[PDB]
Design a protein around this ligand. Structure first.
Ligand SMILES: [Zn+2]
Lengths: 131, 50, 108, 104, 87, 178, 60
């Protein structure tokens, strides 16, 4: 069972630039953050294969916002793209997103389907936010 | 009590006898928590003085 | 035999006693995998032998901390392979203040 | 003037004259024993009228004792220096933080 | 003057960050320069004295065992801030 | 030099008493010990690489039987994990995103890099709960495809912790008599 | 030559002391990258001493 994705190319689940901008740059002379820790989970879609389309990782309680920058380029057509954090979809802003997690264990289902020809490609995540 | 209640709670011990058990990077070495127990004993025994 | 508190299976040869819920034991497999609750971390679990030493001394001090006026369960906290009266004398004869007292202070 | 007069500098780089006259006239134990006595006496005078953060004089004497025993063992003056190490030392550990969410 | 091998490191981080724009605080640049010029004096004296201590060394004496232990153990005990009983 | 090959043989023949990997025959078949007593390994890089190639070949051959969970499979895997990380560390000592832009714009990056084999896990949603399983013990030298014992399991890929340094309580949070 | 010790260096120091008892040149070679006798014995006088040994020495 090995089928590299032919629709999605790369996905970057990194830290939201808005959270960072309020962590390194104080607001009205506020005190800096106790520490800083950022992470960019890159997933090369060409190397990864479906039937193994589930991933899991953990974040600190400080990281409660993240922006799934999708990079879908192997389609070159008009293609449906949607993701559903906790089975509720979020709208887009290449395609930049913006996700607000919760204090538990939440999964976000990224989905892309071409309209010309019916090829569907899923990608799921599980982001344990630690209390 | 002050000097003992500020030690790292993840304190472990690397001993010169773990070579003979061939600990791998993905297993648990025996006698890993040796100074941790020896520190908890000296701490709880100082709290249990009265 | 101690039972793990997460998978519900018997411990094999060693247990991992956490020190914030002092009645909770976790087997070895569920400590590498980190299958324990997300409230704790893997920095308060002590490795203990299932089957006087630092382990038994720590368990004695934990039994005395958990229960003050009951000396029967103290033996059931260290497993129990000796008389109920060895722990009383072992606790009374600990030289824990002598190290700090020495620092300060005919008929022929 | 500077720059490799600072990279090697440690706060234990003062010899004065005592260690020179002694190590020249021999008998360095007459200096280590005397300084260990001036450490114990200045420590009993520290536990009494309780204060912490050992004074600078005690730190300087501890440096002097360290430098003397180090030079003695270095020049091969002790036959089979005693080995009494614990054969273990403290090390930190990583955190396999919990993998199942808390329920409240 | 610094009294640790780590305080001088920050005294140099400070001089490294202040010297970028001179003529703003001259009494901090001059002070740090004076401190460095006294530390290079101490370090040079110790450098030229550590050889005189290994040249004027004496060969007629050999430090004895069962007395070095009574000094190594007593030094480790006195450095851990624990008492050493009167011998 | 040659003083290291005898130490490697003394470590392998001391850690293979339960794995039984140096007494296995591979292509006329010869074992690993029958390569030490008669010089075929050399202090040069070719000898070290020949030894690592032989250890990997024997572990690979042994892994393809002792099918999946038998102790004879996990012990050989733990031996390959010990031997590879041993020979490596001794041969070494002998011989754009939206956030990355602002970070590289405002910070200097002293980076490091390493590669860790990923591990997998089975996971499902029974009727109302999303729950996983234990870490599958399949080796990293096995090339047999997954069987999916239920034809409804989903293969989660757990990412190793990338934070080498972490914080911990001060042993006052572990204690505090009750 | 560095002047700050680490965990793999205190480890190799302990191993060198266990194997070689007074040959400081061989201990320093085992921890190659540090001073021969100015840093391999300074970190020896500061190493702890076993508790049983201290008890038996101070007692007798
Ligand atoms: Zn368990």
């Amino acid at each position: 069972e090995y089928k590299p994705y032919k629709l999605i190319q790369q996905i970057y689940i990194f830290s939201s630039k808005n959270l960072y901008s309020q962590a390194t740059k104080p607001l009205l002379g506020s005190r800096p953050s106790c520490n800083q820790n950022w992470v960019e989970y890159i997933f090369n879609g060409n190397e990864l294969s479906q039937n193994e389309n589930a991933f899991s990782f953990m974040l600190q309680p400080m990281q409660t916002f993240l922006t799934l920058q999708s990079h879908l380029t192997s389609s070159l057509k008009d293609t449906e793209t949607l993701l559903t954090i906790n089975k509720e979809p979020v709208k887009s802003r290449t395609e930049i997103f913006d996700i607000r997690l919760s204090e538990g264990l939440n999964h976000l289902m990224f989905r892309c389907e071409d309209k010309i020809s019916h090829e569907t490609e899923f990608m799921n995540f599980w982001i344990n936010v630690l209390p | 009590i002050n000097e003992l209640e500020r030690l790292p709670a993840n304190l472990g011990t690397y001993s010169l006898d773990d070579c003979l058990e061939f600990i791998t990077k993905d297993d648990l070495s025996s006698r890993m928590d040796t100074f941790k127990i020896k520190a908890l004993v000296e701490l709880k025994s100082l709290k249990l003085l009265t | 035999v101690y039972i793990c508190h997460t998978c519900g299976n018997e411990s094999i040869n060693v247990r991992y006693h956490n020190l914030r819920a002092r009645d909770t034991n976790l087997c070895s497999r569920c400590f590498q995998e980190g299958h324990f609750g997300a409230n704790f971390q893997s920095s308060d679990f002590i490795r203990l032998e299932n089957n006087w030493s630092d382990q038994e001394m720590l368990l004695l001090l934990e039994g005395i901390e958990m229960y003050e006026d009951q000396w029967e369960k103290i033996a059931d906290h260290v497993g129990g392979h000796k008389r109920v009266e060895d722990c009383i004398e072992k606790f009374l004869s600990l030289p824990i203040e002598d190290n700090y007292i020495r620092e300060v202070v005919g008929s022929k | 003037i500077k720059l490799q007069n600072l990279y090697n500098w440690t706060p234990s780089n003062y010899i004065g004259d005592d260690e020179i006259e002694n190590f020249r006239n021999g008998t360095p134990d007459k200096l280590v024993s005397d300084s260990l006595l001036k450490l114990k006496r200045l420590r009993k005078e520290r536990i009494l009228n309780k204060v912490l953060k050992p004074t600078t004089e005690e730190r300087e004497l501890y440096f002097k004792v360290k430098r003397i025993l180090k030079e003695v063992i270095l020049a091969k003056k002790v036959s089979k220096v005693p080995i009494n190490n614990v054969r273990a030392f403290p090390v930190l550990q990583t955190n396999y933080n919990g993998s199942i969410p808390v329920v409240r | 003057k610094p009294r640790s091998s780590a305080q001088l490191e920050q005294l140099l981080y400070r001089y490294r960050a202040i010297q970028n724009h001179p003529k703003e605080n001259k009494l901090e640049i001059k002070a740090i320069e004076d401190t460095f010029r006294n530390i290079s004096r101490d370090q040079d004296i110790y450098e030229t004295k550590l050889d005189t201590l290994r040249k004027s060394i004496d060969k007629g004496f050999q430090y004895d065992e069962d007395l070095l232990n009574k000094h190594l153990v007593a030094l480790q005990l006195l450095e851990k801030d624990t008492d050493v009983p009167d011998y | 030099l040659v003083d290291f090959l005898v130490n490697v043989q003394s470590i392998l023949n001391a850690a293979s008493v339960k794995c039984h990997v140096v007494d296995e025959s591979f292509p006329v078949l010869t074992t690993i010990n029958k390569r030490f007593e008669n010089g075929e390994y050399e202090p040069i890089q070719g000898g070290f690489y020949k030894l690592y190639h032989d250890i990997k070949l024997v572990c690979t051959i042994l892994i393809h039987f002792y099918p999946q969970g038998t102790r004879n499979y996990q012990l050989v895997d733990k031996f390959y994990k010990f031997s590879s990380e041993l020979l490596l560390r001794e041969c070494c000592r002998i011989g754009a995103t939206e956030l990355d832009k602002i970070i590289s714009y405002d910070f200097i990056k002293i980076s490091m890099n390493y590669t860790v084999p990923i591990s997998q896990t089975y996971q499902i949603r029974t009727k109302d709960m999303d729950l996983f399983s234990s870490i599958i013990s399949k080796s990293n030298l096995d090339k047999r495809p997954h069987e999916l014992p239920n034809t409804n399991f989903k293969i989660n890929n757990v990412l190793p912790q990338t934070d080498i340094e972490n914080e911990a309580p001060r042993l006052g949070f572990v204690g505090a008599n009750t | 030559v560095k002047k700050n010790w680490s965990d793999q260096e205190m480890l190799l120091l302990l191993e060198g002391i266990e194997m070689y008892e007074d040959q400081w040149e061989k201990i320093a070679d085992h921890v190659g990258g540090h001073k021969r006798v100015e840093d391999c014995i300074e970190k020896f006088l500061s190493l702890p001493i076993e508790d049983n040994y201290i008890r038996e020495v101070v007692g007798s």
